[PDB]
Amino acid sequence: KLENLKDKLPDIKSIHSKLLLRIGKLQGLYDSVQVINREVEGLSEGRTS
């Protein structure tokens, strides 16, 4: 089993990449929550639109 492991690199590579995409989206959604909070802050502090 040690000699032939090249057949198992693809599935591991696949899960590794799939997990990176999931982290990508969660980090993205966190940027969005920071943008909506900032716009609500502006709105609250006085009037300016």
């Binding site: 989206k25 969660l26 993205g28 959604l29 969005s32 909506i36 639109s49």
Partner: protein
């Protein structure tokens, strides 16, 4: 919830958020701009009523 959906692309969801935030500003602004101003006209009418 669309951000973490499988086939969703982040760009489109970010665009939806901007439109949504702008729509929030407009409805609240219209109601508030009316509230006070229409109420101020009503208050001038009330001052006339107090004179009566």
């Amino acid at each position: 919830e669309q951000y973490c959906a499988p086939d969703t692309d982040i760009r489109g969801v970010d665009a939806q958020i901007k439109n949504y935030l702008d729509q929030i500003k407009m409805a609240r602004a219209k109601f508030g701009l009316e509230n006070k101003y229409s109420l101020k006209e009503r208050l001038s009418t009330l001052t006339k009523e107090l004179n009566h």
